Amino acid sequence: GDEEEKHLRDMMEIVIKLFMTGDWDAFHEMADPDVKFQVDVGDKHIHRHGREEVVEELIRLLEHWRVRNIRIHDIKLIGDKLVVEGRWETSYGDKSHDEDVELIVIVVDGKIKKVRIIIR
Amino acid sequence: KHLRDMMEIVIKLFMTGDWDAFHEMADPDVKFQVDVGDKHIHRHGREEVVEELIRLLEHWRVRNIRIHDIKLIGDKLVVEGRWETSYGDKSHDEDVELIVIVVDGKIKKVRIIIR
């Protein structure tokens, strides 16, 4: 009962974020009110909490790279955790800003409770 | 367990930008079926299936994908759901059933049924 429901929720998260175009505008409707967000960009490490703080920060992150989607290289599903290794799908005219990215998404009770993004 | 996660990870190669991940996992004799009312598409062979996915999945504009049921029965995974397909402005929602059979770690059959 509770297990399959959690798995149905995980799959719906994957298709919205990394399949159904970008649809990262829909991140607000799937984010837990107390969602955590930490960005690792080199030696700068950002930490945000709360749905509004996270959405505003994530939107700025996507604006700096002009992210449309994530060209996925590998994905692992570990219980309630999504682990993605990939490369940016940007709107630039070439590959100048397609930096490698790792994304970790924790799903709790059908809502995204934690997002981690590491860019090298 | 691992079998459930492995079968689920396999399905998530429907969404890797390119069909490089499906190609390395597909059995060379993989079957592909798409049943949409009267139109029945049937492709057999790893090369023939990928060319069908290029012509099919790309121009298909899927939105609001909802998962209603997931069942793991041995080597077969059955997913039932609902998405919003569109042609231009016109759009409608329809029920979809995804069936994928993995034989010895390789994708042997992929069937998509749309009521």
Molecular structure report:
- The structure is a homodimer.
- Chain A is α+β, with helices and mostly antiparallel strands and 120 residues long.
- The first copy, chain A, has one domain (1-120).
- In chain A, 30% of the residues lie in helices and 48% in strands.
- The first copy, chain A, has helices at residues 2-18, 27-30, 51-65; strands spanning 31-41, 44-49, 67-78, 81-90, 100-108, 111-119.
- The first copy, chain A, has a 6-stranded mixed sheet with strand order 2-1-6-5-4-3.
- Chain A is globular, with a radius of gyration of 14 Å.
- The termini of chain A are far apart.
- At the A-B interface, helix 1 and strand 3 of A face helix 1 and strand 3 of B.
- It is classed as de novo protein.
- Keywords: NTF2, DE novo design, DE novo protein.
Instruction: Calculate Rg of chain A over CA atoms.
Output: 14 Å
Instruction: Give the terminus-to-terminus CA distance of chain A.
Output: 40 Å
The sequence of SSEs of chain A as H and E is: HHEEHEEEE
Largest inter-chain interface? A-B, 23 and 22 residues
Domain count of chain A: the total is 1
- The tally of helices of chain A reads 3
Oligomerization status of the protein chains: homodimer
Shape of chain A: globular
Helix content of chain A: 25-40%
Show the helix and strand layout.
Two copies of one chain form a homodimer.
Chain A (H helix, E strand, L loop, with lengths): L1 H17 L8 H4 E11 L2 E6 L1 H15 L1 E12 L2 E10 L9 E9 L2 E9 L1
Parallel strand pairs in A: 1-6
Antiparallel strand pairs in A: 1-2, 3-4, 4-5, 5-6
